[PDB]
Amino acid sequence: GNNVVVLGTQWGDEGKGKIVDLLTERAKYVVRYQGGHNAGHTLVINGEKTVLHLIPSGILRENVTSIIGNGVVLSPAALMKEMKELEDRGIPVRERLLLSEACPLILDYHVALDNAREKARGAKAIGTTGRGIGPAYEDKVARRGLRVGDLFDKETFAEKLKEVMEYHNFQLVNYYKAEAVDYQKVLDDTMAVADILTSMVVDVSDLLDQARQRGDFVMFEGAQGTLLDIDHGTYPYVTSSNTTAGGVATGSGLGPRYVDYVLGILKAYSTRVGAGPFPTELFDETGEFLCKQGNEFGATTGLRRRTGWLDTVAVRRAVQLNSLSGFCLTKLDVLDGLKEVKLCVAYRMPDGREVTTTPLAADDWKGVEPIYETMPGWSESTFGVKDRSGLPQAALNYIKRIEELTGVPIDIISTGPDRTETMILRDPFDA
Amino acid sequence: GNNVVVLGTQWGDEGKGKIVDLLTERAKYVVRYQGGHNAGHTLVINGEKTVLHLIPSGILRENVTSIIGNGVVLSPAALMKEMKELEDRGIPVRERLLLSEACPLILDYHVALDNAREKARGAKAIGTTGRGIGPAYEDKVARRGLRVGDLFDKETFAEKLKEVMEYHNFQLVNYYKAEAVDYQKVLDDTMAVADILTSMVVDVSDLLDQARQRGDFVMFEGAQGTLLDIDHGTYPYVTSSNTTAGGVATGSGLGPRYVDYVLGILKAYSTRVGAGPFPTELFDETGEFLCKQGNEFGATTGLRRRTGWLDTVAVRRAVQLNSLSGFCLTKLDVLDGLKEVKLCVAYRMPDGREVTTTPLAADDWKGVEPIYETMPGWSESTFGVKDRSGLPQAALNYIKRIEELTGVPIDIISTGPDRTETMILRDPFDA
Ligand SMILES: Nc1nc2c(ncn2[C@@H]2O[C@H](COP(=O)(O)OP(=O)(O)O)[C@@H](O)[C@H]2O)c(=O)[nH]1
Ligand SMILES: Nc1nc2c(ncn2[C@@H]2O[C@H](COP(=O)(O)OP(=O)(O)O)[C@@H](O)[C@H]2O)c(=O)[nH]1
Ligand SMILES: O=P(O)(O)OC[C@H]1O[C@@H](n2cnc3c(OP(=O)(O)O)ncnc32)[C@H](O)[C@@H]1O
Ligand SMILES: O=P(O)(O)OC[C@H]1O[C@@H](n2cnc3c(OP(=O)(O)O)ncnc32)[C@H](O)[C@@H]1O
Ligand SMILES: [Mg+2]
Ligand SMILES: [Mg+2]
Numbered sequence: 001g002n003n004v005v006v007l008g009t010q011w012g013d014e015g016k017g018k019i020v021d022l023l024t025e026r027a028k029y030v031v032r033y034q035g036g037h038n039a040g041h042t043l044v045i046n047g048e049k050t051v052l053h054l055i056p057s058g059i060l061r062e063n064v065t066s067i068i069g070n071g072v073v074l075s076p077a078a079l080m081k082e083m084k085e086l087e088d089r090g091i092p093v094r095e096r097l098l099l100s101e102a103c104p105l106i107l108d109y110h111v112a113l114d115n116a117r118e119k120a121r122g123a124k125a126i127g128t129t130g131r132g133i134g135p136a137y138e139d140k141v142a143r144r145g146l147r148v149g150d151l152f153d154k155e156t157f158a159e160k161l162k163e164v165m166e167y168h169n170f171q172l173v174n175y176y177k178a179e180a181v182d183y184q185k186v187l188d189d190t191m192a193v194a195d196i197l198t199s200m201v202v203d204v205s206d207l208l209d210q211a212r213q214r215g216d217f218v219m220f221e222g223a224q225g226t227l228l229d230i231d232h233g234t235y236p237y238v239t240s241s242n243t244t245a246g247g248v249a250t251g252s253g254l255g256p257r258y259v260d261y262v263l264g265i266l267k268a269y270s271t272r273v274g275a276g277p278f279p280t281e282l283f284d285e286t287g288e289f290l291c292k293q294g295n296e297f298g299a300t301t302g303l304r305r306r307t308g309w310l311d312t313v314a315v316r317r318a319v320q321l322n323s324l325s326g327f328c329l330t331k332l333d334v335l336d337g338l339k340e341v342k343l344c345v346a347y348r349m350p351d352g353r354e355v356t357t358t359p360l361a362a363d364d365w366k367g368v369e370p371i372y373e374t375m376p377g378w379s380e381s382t383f384g385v386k387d388r389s390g391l392p393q394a395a396l397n398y399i400k401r402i403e404e405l406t407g408v409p410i411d412i413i414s415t416g417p418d419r420t421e422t423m424i425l426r427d428p429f430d431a
Numbered sequence: 432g433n434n435v436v437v438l439g440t441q442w443g444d445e446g447k448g449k450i451v452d453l454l455t456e457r458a459k460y461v462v463r464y465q466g467g468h469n470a471g472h473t474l475v476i477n478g479e480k481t482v483l484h485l486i487p488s489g490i491l492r493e494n495v496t497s498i499i500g501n502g503v504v505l506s507p508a509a510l511m512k513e514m515k516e517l518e519d520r521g522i523p524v525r526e527r528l529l530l531s532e533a534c535p536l537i538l539d540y541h542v543a544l545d546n547a548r549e550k551a552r553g554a555k556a557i558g559t560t561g562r563g564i565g566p567a568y569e570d571k572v573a574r575r576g577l578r579v580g581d582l583f584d585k586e587t588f589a590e591k592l593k594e595v596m597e598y599h600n601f602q603l604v605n606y607y608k609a610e611a612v613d614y615q616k617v618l619d620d621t622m623a624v625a626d627i628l629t630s631m632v633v634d635v636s637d638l639l640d641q642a643r644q645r646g647d648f649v650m651f652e653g654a655q656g657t658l659l660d661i662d663h664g665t666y667p668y669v670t671s672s673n674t675t676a677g678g679v680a681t682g683s684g685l686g687p688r689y690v691d692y693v694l695g696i697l698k699a700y701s702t703r704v705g706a707g708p709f710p711t712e713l714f715d716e717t718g719e720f721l722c723k724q725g726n727e728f729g730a731t732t733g734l735r736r737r738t739g740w741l742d743t744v745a746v747r748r749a750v751q752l753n754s755l756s757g758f759c760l761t762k763l764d765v766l767d768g769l770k771e772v773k774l775c776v777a778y779r780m781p782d783g784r785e786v787t788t789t790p791l792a793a794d795d796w797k798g799v800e801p802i803y804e805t806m807p808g809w810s811e812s813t814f815g816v817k818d819r820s821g822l823p824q825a826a827l828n829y830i831k832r833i834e835e836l837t838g839v840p841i842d843i844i845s846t847g848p849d850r851t852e853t854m855i856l857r858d859p860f861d862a
Binding site (some may be wrong): 028070071101102117126128134137138140141142143144147149150152153156170171175203205206209230232236237238240241242245246247248249250251253256257258259262284317320321322323324325357360361363364 | 499502532533548557569571572573574575578581583584587601602605636640661662663667669671673678679680681682684688689690693713748751754755788791792794795824
């Protein structure tokens with residue numbers, strides 16, 4: 001299919017960055033359609049690590065035009081920081097990166113707010129990445145936030161910014177009893193970059209409609225994961241954007257009927273950073289194992305990540321929410337050396353009922369317990385293996401079992417962090 | 432196609448209610464996926480008017496199950512009010528209506544807030560319908576708002592509600608210097624209806640995935656219109672939800688790949704209630720005419736509606752944003768008796784540039800001017816006509832011209848408010 005969507009089917013960090021980088025070889029465009037720099041994508045090419053947050057993961061391929069879709073909450077400071085870093089490394093970002101004038105801006109007060117709220121919640125704290133994602137989205141929805149296109153008139157921008165800031169400042173000092181955020185500091189930091197920012201603007205919907213009508217290969221890059229969806233995730237322990245395939249058309253402006261294949265990234269084992277339900281969470285040795293081997297620590301905040309077994313029930317919600325076309329089994333190489341692996345196939349609800357469907361809001365997950373299927377592990381190494389043949393049968397069964405349990409084929413299997421450490425069984429672009 | 436989406440291509444009020452009611456004859460389900468009771472849908476069957484706001488327009492057909500999707504901001508008071516009204520009229524709502532536990536709740540403070548903000552904006556006031564749509568969506572995104580499923584535990588609900596209310600109350604009295612909203616009044620009004628509310632809950636995504644897998648005819652009913660889209664509309668003069676086809680999958684939980692046909696409702700002339708850009712707005716006799724004949728006054732607030740000529744440029748943005756499959760030319764009967772009609776085919780930008788693309792945010796529409804195409808009108812009456820033959824050639828040309836100018840066929844033509852006063856040239860369900 002021409003328009004391919006790559007997204008996380010769990011709670012982020014499944015490995016979208018690598019896969020997006022990999023798959024963009026044949027792509028004309030790559031589009032981020034939601035989130036901001038809370039995202040953390042690690043690309044590894046012949047050993048060279050590149051960590052992207054706000055910039056689309058297709059930025060390393062000169063044949064691809066990376067787009068920041070209107071859905072993205074964009075931090076000028078964050079963009080500048082990343083651009084500079086890639087530029088020093090030979091990546092002419094400004095030559096490859098375009099962006100929507102409709103993108104809301106993440107300015108300092110947003111982080112001020114993000115921190116304050118987080119504080120206020122005390123114990124039942126969400127565990128947000130500390131960027132100002134939440135407030136930026138709130139300001140969008142409230143229709144008071146600033147967007148890229150607001151920089152088209154700096155004086156008017158100073159007017160709007162003065163307003164929005166006094167408004168937020170009042171809340172910060174009087175209610176939160178927190179320090180105000182200096183309006184002039186913000187206006188200044190902003191105006192300095194404004195010109196660079198404005199230079200990358202393009203009418204994204206139209207560009208995408210044109211690309212679409214030409215047949216251009218376009219990849220949409222997801223941020224965060226399905227279960228962190230503001231609507232469909234473990235609310236309120238979620239991110240503030242729709243991480244489900246529906247955000248592509250809303251955050252890019254491309255009509256929904258033009259999505260061709262939805263590729264869902266699947267970690268082979270589960271992780272979460274932030275508070276919230278997690279039935280298959282492990283707190284034992286194997287958990288520790290899964291964490292160490294997988295080097296599970298957030299690419300955007302370091303914070304160790306919670307680990308647990310893959311959960312076909314949660315994965316199955318992801319399948320329906322996103323119209324999955326196929327999966328990209330990632331980190332299989334991490335299971336190597338376990339005596340046995342297991343998949344959560346059903347949930348035992350607190351009233352005794354057994355169910356193969358997930359609850360929605362966090363409180364409804366309160367006391368659910370996982371009912372497992374236990375498969376034999378494999379001692380052979382699968383790291384770097386690039387052909388099914390190189391995988392032991394135990395691994396092949398685990399893979400088939402996931403397919404059986406989900407009804408979606410594993411078209412791509414990843415066995416290490418490096419771009420080429422992958423098995424492309426079915427390339428979504430031909431699919 | 433099995434899953435058909437019906438939405439407004441302009442600024443609301445194109446006539447979704449009638450069309451949805453009409454088209455649901457063959458439907459198993461009808462789903463609202465966004466907005467709340469700011470919407471106003473007028474159904475007319477053999478002269479009997481029915482005005483829906485929050486309840487899906489398929490509620491009058493016992494063969495159809497009406498669903499309030501998670502995307503909808505739901506006012507318990509509003510729901511109760513409408514249910515009662517339909518029940519007295521022989522409509523057993525509770526028997527036909529189901530709803531998502533994920534729907535955020537619109538409670539009193541939300542209206543308190545909606546009013547306060549509106550006040551604060553003074554002159555540059557959005558012109559929101561006065562329901563608490565904006566705040567309810569903000570509370571959603573901020574992850575502090577209450578949802579239907581929160582009623583599954585009334586004590587915890589009282590806890591969460593006490594919190595959210597003190598929070599908002601502080602803002603209302605100290606900043607806005609407005610009157611606080613009584614927590615106990617809210618908790619009470621809510622708890623009284625809670626049980627009814629909870630009784631209608633269903634897991635909508637799953638139900639839709641099942642329906643989808645059965646082949647069931649499902650209609651998604653849009654609220655508001657494309658150009659009022661929070662992301663793609665004339666921001667900030669927009670509604671707080673994505674009125675574009677992308678909201679269907681986000682606000683219903685049905686995977687995006689399962690949308691089959693997107694039907695866009697097209698008024699044949701333009702209207703707007705609320706502040707904001709409107710290039711083809713008319714302030715002359717014909718405007719007055721268009722308003723009087725069309726009886727253009729908001730079904731949700733009465734407020735006279737601004738009128739202007741149809742705008743192919745704005746309509747064309749709608750075509751790409753929503754992947755339109757076809758149009759439903761509505762109110763054609765209203766043009767009868769004009770000497771000449773005209774369509775805006777291009778925009779003359781303020782720097783002299785001529786463009787066939789629309790700007791996004793309001794300020795960017797600032798001084799655009801419409802460049803028209805002037806077609807001969809028609810004196811014959813088209814009211815109630817149900818066969819193309821009954822339409823004068825002048826009308827047929829106007830219709831073909833819209834098709835030529837947009838590239839989307841007019842599969843349905845409506846010539847009066849009554850259900851049967853329509854021409855179904857291509858029924859989306861077979862399409
Ligand atoms: N061992 C192993 N590491 C992988 C594999 N695929 C990706 N990685 C690494 O695992 C991490 C994926 O987390 P992250 O980059 O935050 O993924 P993203 O947030 O979804 O883009 C990064 O450290 C990658 O370098 C794989 O198949 N095996
Ligand atoms: N004259 C005329 N009225 C129509 C036609 N279709 C619908 N109506 C009426 O025009 C209005 C449509 O506005 P509204 O009900 O608010 O549409 P909605 O908000 O899109 O559901 C209602 O008064 C309908 O009764 C039509 O083809 N001709
Ligand atoms: O308001 P926010 O800043 O968005 O934080 C809210 C919640 O969402 C989580 N979170 C945010 N981005 C995440 C991410 O990005 P990628 O998978 O794309 O690499 N991966 C994993 N978890 C992520 C935070 O942990 C928290 O639970
Ligand atoms: O915050 P809000 O309460 O949503 O108001 C914001 C803006 O959106 C407009 N508006 C809201 N619902 C509308 C509607 O519903 P239907 O077309 O579905 O019948 N039709 C037309 N205009 C509508 C208001 O006029 C205002 O411009
Ligand atoms: Mg990451
Ligand atoms: Mg209406």
